[PDB]
Design a protein around this ligand. Structure first.
Ligand code: CLA
Ligand code: CLA
Ligand code: CLA
Ligand code: CLA
Ligand code: CLA
Ligand SMILES: CCCCCC(=O)OC\C(C=C=C1C(C)(C)C[C@H](OC(C)=O)C[C@@]1(C)O)=C/C=C/C(C)=C/C=C/C=C(C)/C=C/C=C(\C)C(=O)C[C@@]12O[C@]1(C)C[C@@H](O)CC2(C)C
Ligand code: A1ECV
Ligand SMILES: CC(=O)O[C@H]1CC(C)(C)C(=C=C/C(C)=C/C=C/C(C)=C/C=C/C=C(C)/C=C/C=C(\C)C(=O)C[C@@]23O[C@]2(C)C[C@@H](O)CC3(C)C)[C@](C)(O)C1
Ligand SMILES: CC(=O)O[C@H]1CC(C)(C)C(=C=C/C(C)=C/C=C/C(C)=C/C=C/C=C(C)/C=C/C=C(\C)C(=O)C[C@@]23O[C@]2(C)C[C@@H](O)CC3(C)C)[C@](C)(O)C1
Ligand code: KC2
Ligand code: KC2
Lengths: 236, 225, 228
């Protein structure tokens, strides 16, 4: 590419392209180099978006806030605040029955499948993020298919970004990258403060213990195959 | 600077002079920085030993607990005052000092200001200005500055600037003698100790004791010293 | 051209001593392999010995002081303070096997003609630069960063700077070989090196046997440890 030099300069004019590892030269997929920078950019943007979502979720789940809906399934089940009564926002994921985590993960998987599809991306006008195209672009959920009409698209559902200034959109992309890096640092600080108490200067005595694995989605209560055999040996 | 005092000359017994220009610039920068740090440390040590404890430490100033500033000040000299602050306080003070040092070493900011090669090379001792354009663009306008925040040095001739730099170098050498002599006088030693001067730390170079993660070091008892 | 380069490198290593070959190994055809290949092998082996000795000296300091990584790994079996000869005595046997295997993989990569000819180089006996390591650029699956310069901050060095770096490398290598075998000799016979008397404890096991006093057979791998 070599355009990422100028993008790194626009993100921060003091520190430009900062890569001690020189990972832009690393052709990890053995495609063109353009594909490698495209994959790295898309991975950074997706990581950042997930991190801001998880940061706001952690902040609003760590202090006694829960929806007054039910999540029962029929005359019994979780009251939607019993998960809040399991501890901080890492035992709550390990308390969402069995099917709730499955449906959440499958929704994210179908969303990523919609992201990756070149027929869907090509119908919007872009391509795959490594075969040229625009990194971080989510295609329209309306134009690509979905035979029953849906109300809104994922990006800008209410329409409050239309006819915006293109330079304002570029500034928003740069701010998204910077806030994504900052939110990744924040959410990993919180996740470290879950398990490790002695880390960081701040956040001392404000975080739930969570005697468990942050990186294990399925918990010991799941009745999926293996799982219990997969949780027979903890680690550090 | 050839020789500020004509009766001394070029006192270089170790032969570090007549070296590469980058080495000479680094040596001059280290001399100026050590002298300035020694002068500031001597002034702070004198103020702390006299007793200048501030009316502060209110509204959860210690991390939910409220320990008074005089309680930290009621430990002895400055050496005991540097061992009574919390780990976050010393860590954040060191981080602020490191941020200032890294901003001073920044070649982009120095070249924007109109300077020479960084790591305090050409024109050593020049702190870059944290204002105007292409610096600190993300909020934080920095209404104050590092050198002359009130603009007391607004106008100065180049000859006057050179004379003030030579005077600062001589005072920095005197302060590098003096602050080390004061620390030695705290640790017994020296000539005419007197003046109570409290007690001294293990070496003064321990930095941050009673921390977590890497501070499990019982090695500060020996190594001769 | 061979002996002339050898004289020049010896003169740059030390102007006073110069070329010192009392044994005359630079005139012996080692495998009936001319003069160029013999001096290339000798320089490559000297450079390799010096690099391994420098790394061994630093590692000996690190283990004698006690500088463990942390948890879970092979450092968890080694007792807290056993002196550097005994830290290659308590790591598991498979850890020693895999370490020696990775070193052999590195040697084989440094010698494989596909790796050398990838970045335009030939064998040191066949006419290449002694001590050079080809980067990684033939190893089927891509490698993230090279071994000589992992972060590539030496790519702006002048050839004169590289030559002075090689001379410093050889001198430091010789002096580190001498220091490291000072340590190993004091760990075996007392009173050899007078400075190191009483610092390094005596060791009974053989240094030249890798699996002598072999370590235990423990499985430090958790999660899905089907190899119990
Ligand atoms: C996994 C998330 C991720 C990904 C995929 C990227 C991807 C990228 N970053 Mg990036 N970055 C990230 C997180 C990430 N970043 C974070 C969290 C920060 C803030 C600390 C930054 C700050 C940053 C700057 C300042 C710059 C980049 C740049 C770049 C681009 C080229 C350099 C490169 O490939 O480095 C990729 C690096 C990685 C993929 C990280 C490797 C992770 C390893 C394998 C795991 C263990 C290492 C350890 C956790 C990291 C060290 C910790 C450290 C705090 C001490 C590339 C698109 C440059 C740019 O803008 O060019 C477009 C640039 O100048 N990054
Ligand atoms: C982090 C603390 C810190 C440090 C390292 C310095 C460092 C310095 N100050 Mg300073 N200063 C500080 C906090 C600090 N100041 C605060 C909080 C105030 C407000 C009371 C001032 C008010 C101040 C004035 C009014 C002046 C300095 C001056 C100076 C310089 C001598 C030196 C670079 C002097 C200077 O730069 O003039 C040449 C000067 O005249 N400072
Ligand atoms: C301001 C930055 C900062 C500072 C000064 C420290 C300081 C420290 N960290 Mg830490 N840490 C930070 C950010 C920081 N951390 C972030 C953002 C993360 C998340 C990626 C972590 C994750 C982390 C872990 C997982 C561990 C530390 C540990 C440590 C200690 C060694 C030391 C007190 C270690 C420690 O003391 O554990 C007992 C340790 O194991 N840190
Ligand atoms: C195994 C390590 C090793 C290797 C392969 C070499 C290889 C070489 N050295 Mg060298 N050297 C070494 C270690 C080594 N050195 C050490 C540790 C020192 C410091 C003492 C030196 C100091 C040195 C100088 C000053 C010079 C060389 C030079 C040379 C080159 C030509 C001389 C020759 O034929 O070999 C050298 C001879 C041998 C390697 C003999 C092999 C060892 C025998 C078989 C075993 C003896 C063991 C015995 C216990 C030793 C007793 C020591 C004492 C009682 C005398 C050649 C590339 C010359 C040069 O610069 O060319 C570029 C040169 O002038 N060497
Ligand atoms: C399996 C790993 C492996 C492999 C294949 C190599 C390969 C090589 N190394 Mg090497 N090396 C290794 C590991 C390895 N290294 C390790 C771990 C170190 C220590 C850090 C070194 C340190 C080293 C140095 C310092 C030098 C080399 C050199 C060399 C080259 C020539 C060696 C030679 O001809 O000797 C051939 C040696 C043998 C055939 C003996 C092998 C040992 C046998 C198998 C032991 C078995 C005996 C025992 C009694 C059997 C037990 C069972 C029995 C009772 C039935 C070659 C590229 C030299 C070089 O490149 O110079 C240009 C050189 O100077 N290596
Ligand atoms: C999951 C991915 C990661 C797995 C890693 C792993 O599995 O193990 C990793 C591990 C331990 C561990 C684990 C944890 C990681 C702690 C946690 C895991 O816990 C679970 C999951 O259960 C698994 C576990 C228990 O294993 C320990 C790794 C240790 C490691 C990697 C030790 C390298 C020594 C290098 C040496 C000695 C250098 C020699 C010297 C060399 C090579 C040379 O001098 C080479 C050279 O001379 C040559 C040949 C020629 C010269 O020209 C050039 C030079 C001079 C350079
Ligand atoms: C930019 C604004 C800013 C924030 C947001 C913070 C973060 C923070 C919190 C939230 C507390 C209180 C936590 C609590 O009590 O709950 C706190 C404290 C300290 N800080 Mg850090 N800090 C410095 C170092 C230091 C010292 C000595 C202490 C304390 O004594 C006190 C403390 O933690 O006591 C144990 C310096 C000096 C170089 C400067 C500065 O402006 O100089 C240029 C700052 C600025 C900031 N700090 N800092
Ligand atoms: C005008 C216009 O264009 O309209 C709209 C259009 C458009 C584009 C659609 C918009 C949008 C979309 C949205 C909703 C965007 C939301 C983005 C979001 C949600 C961004 C969260 C970031 C969270 C962060 C950075 C957390 C940091 C966390 C940090 C820094 C830490 O915790 C640091 C710290 O932990 C350490 C590291 C160690 C500790 O010792 C100390 C502490 C604890 C301090 C906009 C932007 O609304 C504008
Ligand atoms: C009898 C008596 O009394 O004598 C005593 C004396 C004494 C001294 C006490 C004793 C001893 C011990 C000794 C002799 C120990 C010697 C140890 C020794 C000689 C150890 C070398 C290390 C080299 C390293 C790690 C290389 C790093 C290399 C590096 C970091 C690099 O490659 C990077 C770099 O190079 C590039 C790539 C290019 C350039 O840009 C420069 C730099 C650096 C950036 C003894 C044995 O007891 C005997
Ligand atoms: C929940 C996840 C999430 C978070 C937390 C988040 C945060 C921020 C922030 C605040 C830090 C800013 C400032 C910001 C800005 C922009 N975003 Mg977000 N964004 C998220 C999701 C998506 C998705 C799915 C898409 C998207 C996009 C854009 C575009 C460009 C639009 C355009 O140019 O078409 C801009 C300017 C679209 C895209 O990247 O198009 C290339 C797109 O598909 N964003 N975004
Ligand atoms: C642990 C192992 C190790 C140690 C302890 C060590 C010590 C030093 C010292 C300090 C005493 C210096 C000053 C120094 C300098 C240079 N090293 Mg060494 N080096 C080690 C490893 C390697 C490897 C693997 C390679 C290498 C090389 C070079 C070159 C490039 C020359 C050129 O490109 O002309 C220069 C200037 C590369 C090369 O090609 O050497 C022929 C190469 O492949 N080095 N090296």
């Amino acid at each position: 590419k070599a355009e990422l030099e100028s993008l790194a300069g626009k993100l921060n004019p003091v520190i430009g392209y900062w890569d001690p590892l020189n990972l832009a030269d690393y052709d990890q997929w053995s495609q063109g180099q353009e594909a490698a920078i495209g994959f790295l950019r898309h991975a950074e943007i997706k990581h950042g978006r997930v991190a801001m979502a998880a940061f706001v979720g952690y902040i609003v789940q760590s202090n006694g806030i829960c929806w007054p809906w039910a999540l029962t399934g029929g005359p019994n089940g979780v009251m939607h605040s019993d998960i809040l009564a399991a501890g901080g926002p890492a035992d709550q994921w390990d308390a969402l029955p069995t099917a709730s985590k499955l449906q959440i993960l499958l929704f994210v998987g179908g969303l990523e499948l919609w992201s990756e599809n070149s027929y869907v991306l090509g119908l919007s006008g872009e391509k795959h993020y490594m075969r040229g195209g625009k990194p971080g672009f989510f295609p329209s959920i309306k134009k690509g298919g979905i035979p029953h009409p849906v109300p809104f698209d994922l990006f800008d559902p209410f329409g409050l970004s239309k006819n915006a200034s293109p330079e304002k959109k570029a500034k928003g992309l740069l701010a998204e990258i910077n806030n994504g890096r900052l939110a990744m640092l924040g959410i990993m600080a919180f996740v470290s403060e879950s398990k490790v108490p002695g880390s960081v200067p701040a956040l001392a005595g404000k975080i739930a213990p969570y005697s468990g694995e942050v990186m294990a989605p399925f918990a010991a209560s799941d009745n999926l195959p293996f799982v219990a055999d997969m949780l027979k040996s903890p680690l550090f | 600077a050839k020789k500020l005092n004509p009766t001394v000359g070029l006192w270089d017994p170790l032969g570090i002079a007549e070296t590469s220009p980058e080495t000479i610039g680094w040596f001059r920068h280290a001399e100026i920085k050590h002298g300035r740090v020694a002068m500031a440390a001597f002034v702070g040590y004198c103020v702390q030993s006299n007793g200048i404890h501030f009316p502060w430490n209110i509204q959860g100033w210690q991390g939910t607990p409220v320990v008074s500033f005089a309680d930290i000040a009621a430990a002895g000299g400055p050496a005991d005052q540097w061992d009574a602050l919390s780990t976050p306080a010393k860590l954040q003070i060191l981080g602020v000092i490191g941020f200032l040092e890294m901003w001073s070493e920044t070649s982009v900011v120095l070249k924007a200001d109109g300077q020479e090669h960084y790591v305090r090379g050409g024109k050593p001792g020049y702190f870059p200005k944290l204002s105007r354009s292409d610096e600190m663009a993300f909020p934080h306008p920095v209404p104050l500055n590092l050198w002359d925040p009130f603009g007391f040095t607004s106008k100065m001739t180049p000859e006057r600037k050179e004379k003030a730099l030579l005077a600062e170098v001589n005072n920095g050498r005197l302060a590098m003698i003096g602050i080390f002599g004061m620390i030695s006088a705290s640790k017994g030693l020296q000539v005419p100790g007197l003046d109570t001067v409290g007690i001294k730390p293990y070496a003064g170079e321990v930095m941050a004791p009673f921390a977590a993660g890497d501070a499990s070091l019982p090695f500060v008892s020996g190594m001769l010293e | 051209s061979a002996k002339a380069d050898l004289e020049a490198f010896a003169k740059e290593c030390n102007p006073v001593v110069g070329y010192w070959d009392p044994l005359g190994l630079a005139d012996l055809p080692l495998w009936g392999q001319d003069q160029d290949a013999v001096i290339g092998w000798l320089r490559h082996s000297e450079i390799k010995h010096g690099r391994i000795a420098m790394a061994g000296f630093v590692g000996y300091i690190a283990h004698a002081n006690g500088f463990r990584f942390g948890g879970i790994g092979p450092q968890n079996v080694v007792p807290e303070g056993a002196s550097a000869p005994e830290v290659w005595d308590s790591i598991p046997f498979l850890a020693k096997l895999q370490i020696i295997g990775a070193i052999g993989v590195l040697e084989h990569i440094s010698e494989d003609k596909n790796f050398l000819a990838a970045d335009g180089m030939k064998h040191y006996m066949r006419g290449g630069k002694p001590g050079y390591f080809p980067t990684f650029s033939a190893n089927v699956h891509p490698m993230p960063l090279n071994l000589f310069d992992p972060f590539k901050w030496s790519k702006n060095a002048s050839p004169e700077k590289k030559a002075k770096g090689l001379v410093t490398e050889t001198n430091n290598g010789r002096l580190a070989m001498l220091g490291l075998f000072g340590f190993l000799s004091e760990s075996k016979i007392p009173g050899s090196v007078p400075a190191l008397s009483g610092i390094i404890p005596s060791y009974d096991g053989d240094y030249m046997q890798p699996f002598l006093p072999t370590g235990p057979d423990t499985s430090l791998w958790t999660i899905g440890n089907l190899w119990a």
